[PDB]
């Protein structure tokens, strides 16, 4: 009836056929080869360290990543905290302009916006 065999002694054909066919699935291949994280902007990471290269539209900045060397745009929440990053600052970025600024100079931006901490220079 259907394409698949239906014998009692035909488990080998079904198992071999499934093993052959699972390779044509994108998730299976990218999870067995370990290359599924190159489509992400960060690579395999969840946060990326970067250098504050220029102050850009008005809220965002232009930050060069330290790992691969390419330069992206970064979102700085609470627009006044735009002035905390100055030049060549060491920042830690998370995805949101698809990026955002989380940890500037080791400390977090929420500890500076609420004046909990101060930036080590």
């Amino acid at each position: 009836g259907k394409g698949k065999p239906r014998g009692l002694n035909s488990a080998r054909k079904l198992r071999v056929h499934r093993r052959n066919n699972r390779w044509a699935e994108n998730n299976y291949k990218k999870r067995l080869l370990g290359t599924a994280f190159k489509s992400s902007p960060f690579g395999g990471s969840s946060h990326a360290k970067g250098i504050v290269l220029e102050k850009l539209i008005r809220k965002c900045v232009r930050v060069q990543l330290i790992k691969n060397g390419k330069k992206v745009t970064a979102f700085v929440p609470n627009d006044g905290c735009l002035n905390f990053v100055d030049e060549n600052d060491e920042v830690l970025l998370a995805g949101f302009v698809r990026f955002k600024v989380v940890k500037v100079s080791g400390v977090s931006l929420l500890a500076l916006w609420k004046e909990k901490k101060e930036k080590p220079r």
Binding site: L65, I66, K67, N68, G69
Partner: peptide
């Protein structure tokens, strides 16, 4: 090399050691 940070650190180190060896 492998990382941009590593190659810039290597550049700083190699100009430092050229300066040292000409010293």
């Amino acid at each position: 090399y492998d990382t941009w940070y590593e190659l810039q650190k290597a550049k700083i180190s190699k100009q430092l050691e050229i300066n040292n060896i000409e010293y």
